[PDB]
Design a binder for these strands. Structure first.
Ligand SMILES: [Mg+2]
Ligand SMILES: [Mg+2]
Ligand SMILES: [Mg+2]
Ligand SMILES: [Mg+2]
Ligand SMILES: [Mg+2]
Ligand SMILES: [Mg+2]
Ligand SMILES: [Mg+2]
Ligand SMILES: [Mg+2]
Ligand SMILES: [Mg+2]
Ligand SMILES: [Mg+2]
Ligand SMILES: [Mg+2]
Ligand SMILES: [Mg+2]
Ligand SMILES: [Mg+2]
Ligand SMILES: [Mg+2]
Ligand SMILES: [Mg+2]
Ligand SMILES: [Mg+2]
Ligand SMILES: [Mg+2]
Ligand SMILES: [Mg+2]
Ligand SMILES: [Mg+2]
Ligand SMILES: [Mg+2]
Ligand SMILES: [Mg+2]
Ligand SMILES: [Mg+2]
Ligand SMILES: [Mg+2]
Ligand SMILES: [Mg+2]
Ligand SMILES: [Mg+2]
Ligand SMILES: [Mg+2]
Ligand SMILES: [Mg+2]
Ligand SMILES: [Mg+2]
Ligand SMILES: [Mg+2]
Ligand SMILES: [Mg+2]
Ligand SMILES: [Mg+2]
Ligand SMILES: [Mg+2]
Ligand SMILES: [Mg+2]
Ligand SMILES: [Mg+2]
Ligand SMILES: [Mg+2]
Ligand SMILES: [Mg+2]
Ligand SMILES: [Mg+2]
Ligand SMILES: [Mg+2]
Ligand SMILES: [Mg+2]
Ligand SMILES: [Mg+2]
Ligand SMILES: [Mg+2]
Ligand SMILES: [Mg+2]
Ligand SMILES: [Mg+2]
Ligand SMILES: [Mg+2]
Ligand SMILES: [Mg+2]
Ligand SMILES: [Mg+2]
Ligand SMILES: [Mg+2]
Ligand SMILES: [Mg+2]
Ligand SMILES: [Mg+2]
Ligand SMILES: [Mg+2]
Ligand SMILES: [Mg+2]
Ligand SMILES: [Mg+2]
Ligand SMILES: [Mg+2]
Ligand SMILES: [Mg+2]
Ligand SMILES: [Mg+2]
Ligand SMILES: [Mg+2]
Ligand SMILES: [Mg+2]
Ligand SMILES: [Mg+2]
Ligand SMILES: [Mg+2]
Ligand SMILES: [Mg+2]
Ligand SMILES: [Mg+2]
Ligand SMILES: [Mg+2]
Ligand SMILES: [Mg+2]
Ligand SMILES: [Mg+2]
Ligand SMILES: [Mg+2]
Length: 97
RNA sequence: GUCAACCGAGCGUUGAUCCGAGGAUGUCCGAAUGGGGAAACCCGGCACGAGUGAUGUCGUGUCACCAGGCGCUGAAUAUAUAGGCGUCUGGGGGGAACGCGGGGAAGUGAAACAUCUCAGUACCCGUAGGAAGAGAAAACAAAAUGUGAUUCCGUGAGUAGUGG
RNA sequence: UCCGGCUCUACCUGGCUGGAGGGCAGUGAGAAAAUGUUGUGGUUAGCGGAAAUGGCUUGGGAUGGCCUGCCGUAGACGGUGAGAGCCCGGUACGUGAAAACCCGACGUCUGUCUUGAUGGUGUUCCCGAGUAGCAGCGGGCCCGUGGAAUCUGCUGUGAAUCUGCCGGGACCACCCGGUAAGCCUGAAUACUUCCCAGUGACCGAUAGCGGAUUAGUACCGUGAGGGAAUGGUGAAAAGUACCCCGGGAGGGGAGUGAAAGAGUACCUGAAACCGUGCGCUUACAAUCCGUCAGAGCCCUCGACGUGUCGUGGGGUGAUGGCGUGCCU
RNA sequence: UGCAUCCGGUGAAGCCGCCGAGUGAUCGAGUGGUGGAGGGUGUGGGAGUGAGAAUGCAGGCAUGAGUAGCGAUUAGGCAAGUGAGAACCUUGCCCGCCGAAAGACCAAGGGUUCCUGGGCCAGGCCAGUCCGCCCAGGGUGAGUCGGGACCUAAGGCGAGGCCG
C-alpha cells in the first residue's frame, strides 16, 4: 500500500514537518500510521502513574517514503517477470526498493 | 467484527486475516410433516449397531395430510365396486406492487333525497407469472374491385350520445 | 419410385393402411419424448494506472496568498490540522479468473415423412348442440327500458349445416361483408419488497422515512393497535499526571492543547427567565403604565481654566398637558 | 438555481453592540467584542418565502409560592455503637398497637424484590450510615410435594363426511 512496516518515511504536513523515522504499526482499517520520533504527544495515566510521553498516529496521507538520495518520492508498482512480484518504484527514477 | 477500548494470549514471508466460487456443518420453534401441545417443549412406534452381570442405556435413521397413479385385498354379495393397505411423483407456507378472476358499501355531489353519483373505488377471497391478461375476426367499414390478430401511446373530443 | 397386406377368399378396372427414399418442422400455441457442446458477452470478487518534499508568508497546523515551473485521453468524487488535478483512496484508460451461473452456435443422437405430392373436363352420412336464437329475470358495453343491436349469464325452451349463420345500433327485402359455439401463441405495456452505478434549483435534526442514535426499541394498551424523545468535544484522547478544599459530589490551581468563556451535562449559546454590581428614581401617592414638555443628578465630547459655553450627546428621569391594549 | 467571478484563517456565516443613510419593507466593498468555516456583488430564474393571535403544535421557562400537601385511625423516650453528620439505621430498656391479624404457610400472579459484601448523585414525598437504590458475589439439591408419562367433564380441534 505504498507505506509498509519498517520503511523510511518523511512527514509532509504536521507540526513535526521534515523529520524522518521508521514505521512501527499501520492502522489500515483507519489508514493512520504511527512513527517513532514524530508527532510527540504527552499523556497522563493513573494506575507508577506519571506524565508518560507517547507517540500518536498520523494520517498516512501526510507521510511519504524518502529515497536513498534523501529525496522524498511517491511510490510506483511493477510486476516482476522473473517471479511476478509487485515491487516498489521510486517514481522520480523508477528504481527498486 | 463492534460497543470497546483494554489487556491476555496469541497468529504471518512456507504467505495467517481479509474478498469471491463450489462444498460440509446447521440445535430448537416456525408450513412443521411421528402424536400432542401454552413456540422455541412433552410423549412414542419401526430398522441397525453398540455398553452393562443384563436391564437400565445409548446413538443413527424412518414414521403427517391431500392430489395423481401402481401393486395387493375386497363388505354388505354372487360378479364387481366403496372401503382397506403399501410404494413413486407433485402441492402445502411466506413475499411490496402489478395482473386475472369470484364478492363487493357509505360517508360524500346532486346545495335536501330514493333513480343517479361516489364506483366496480376501499376492502375481503382464490390463482398463477415475471409479467399477466388479450390474441388470429363469426371485427370494422360502406361501394373505394377498403381495412386485415392482440396490446400501449397522442388524436380524434369533452364532440355523437347517455342522465329525476 | 418400389414392396406387402386389405375392402369377410385366387385371377384387369376402383377405394386404404404398413416398410426402403426430397418434405412440414420440433423443445414449439398446431407430434411426443430423449439425445450436447462454443462470446474477451456480462455477472459474482480483482491488477496497473501520470505529473511539485518546489520555494517563501501568514500562519497551530496550508490544500491557503505570491513566484516559478507540472501533467492531463485522468481538473467526477472523498480524506488528510483552513480552498489540494502536480499527497492518498481515484478518477480516463487500459487489463484479468482456478471455479460456478444468466444471455449467443457448433459434431453423437432423435422423428417424420417422397402410398405420397403439382398443375385439368360432369351427375348423386362430416367442419365445434343443449350451442345460435327465444320467453322471463338481472348484469357489462357512454347507453338508467328507452324504439333498443350487439355480450354474459339464472330459469324454462330451442334451431338449420351451404338456396346454413350471425352482424351491420328497433325492423325488414335485394343484394354488401366475416365463419360462433375447441385450443392455445413472443413484441410493444404495468409494477419494484431486492441489488448495482449514477443524478437532483430535493431536506439538513420541531426538516427529512415513525426511525441519521440500542427503533418499530422505551413506553401505552391484555387486543387488534398505537408509538415516542434522544446527532456534532477536538485534527488527533493529547479525555485533564500531580497539588489543594471537601466524605464524596463539586471546585480551584498545575499541565494538554490554537483555544478548557472546547472538560466529556462538551461548536456556535439568542429570547423568554433568574441574579450581582454600577448610575439615577421612588415611601402625600389614585393611573392601558406611554407620549409632549421638563428641572435635577451621572457620565461623555469640543471652544473656552479651577466650571462656563457649545448648531452638545447618552442614562435617568422629580413635576405638569393629553391619554380607555391588541385580533376578532 | 445561472452566471463575469469575487469576498474571507490578515477571520466567512451566525450572535451581541455602535454609527450613518433610504419615505418602507431595509441598507451599508460600515465597523467594535464572541465564532472559527464558508459566503457571494450584479442580472435573471424557481419558490415549503416573511407570525401575535386559530382555547394552534413541540420544547423551555414563568407565576399562584416557598403557599397547599407530605398519604390515617397504633406512639414513643432514652442510653450506648457505627458514621461527617444519627428522632428516623444497628444493639440494649422500658411504652403502645394487631393478634380469626397488622402472625405463619401456599395457589394465581410477579421474577431476583432472598442473603452477603460496598458506596448515597439518581430513586424513598425530608437526612439518611438504611432500603424493595444502585454495584459485585452467593443463593434454589426431591423415584416419594407439584405440572408431562395416565383417564376424563364443560368445551375446543378434527381424517374421511355433510353444507357452503
Ligand atoms: Mg467458496
Ligand atoms: Mg452459491
Ligand atoms: Mg452436519
Ligand atoms: Mg403438528
Ligand atoms: Mg408435519
Ligand atoms: Mg394410483
Ligand atoms: Mg362381482
Ligand atoms: Mg404454491
Ligand atoms: Mg347527489
Ligand atoms: Mg345539498
Ligand atoms: Mg353513492
Ligand atoms: Mg360507472
Ligand atoms: Mg415464468
Ligand atoms: Mg397472445
Ligand atoms: Mg376520440
Ligand atoms: Mg490499484
Ligand atoms: Mg506561509
Ligand atoms: Mg495552490
Ligand atoms: Mg486564489
Ligand atoms: Mg474536483
Ligand atoms: Mg477540496
Ligand atoms: Mg489527497
Ligand atoms: Mg340505457
Ligand atoms: Mg336494442
Ligand atoms: Mg365458415
Ligand atoms: Mg378463443
Ligand atoms: Mg412490447
Ligand atoms: Mg440545531
Ligand atoms: Mg397491549
Ligand atoms: Mg498553552
Ligand atoms: Mg446545555
Ligand atoms: Mg460548545
Ligand atoms: Mg428606581
Ligand atoms: Mg415624597
Ligand atoms: Mg385624580
Ligand atoms: Mg395611565
Ligand atoms: Mg395624558
Ligand atoms: Mg387623564
Ligand atoms: Mg482566521
Ligand atoms: Mg475577530
Ligand atoms: Mg467582523
Ligand atoms: Mg471559531
Ligand atoms: Mg451563504
Ligand atoms: Mg440572475
Ligand atoms: Mg432578483
Ligand atoms: Mg409558509
Ligand atoms: Mg413565534
Ligand atoms: Mg393577526
Ligand atoms: Mg399562539
Ligand atoms: Mg403558577
Ligand atoms: Mg397557610
Ligand atoms: Mg400544612
Ligand atoms: Mg401516603
Ligand atoms: Mg442516627
Ligand atoms: Mg387491636
Ligand atoms: Mg376475623
Ligand atoms: Mg383470635
Ligand atoms: Mg399469582
Ligand atoms: Mg410463574
Ligand atoms: Mg433484603
Ligand atoms: Mg454496600
Ligand atoms: Mg449518595
Ligand atoms: Mg427523587
Ligand atoms: Mg446490587
Ligand atoms: Mg378432514
Amino acid at each position: 500500500m505504498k507505506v509498509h512496516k519498517g520503511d523510511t518515511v518523511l512527514v509532509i504536513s504536521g507540526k513535526d514537518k521534515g523529520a524522518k523515522g521508521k514505521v512501527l504499526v499501520a492502522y489500515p482499517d483507519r489508514n493512520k500510521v504511527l512513527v517513532e520520533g514524530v508527532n510527540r504527544i504527552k499523556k497522563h495515566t493513573a494506575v507508577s502513574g506519571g506524565i508518560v510521553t507517547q507517540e500518536a498516529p498520523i494520517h498516512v496521507s501526510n507521510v511519504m517514503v524518502v529515497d536513498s538520495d534523501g529525496k522524498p518520492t511517491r511510490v510506483g508498482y511493477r510486476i516482476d517477470d522473473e517471479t511476478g512480484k509487485k515491487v516498489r518504484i521510486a517514481k522520480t527514477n523508477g528504481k527498486d526498493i
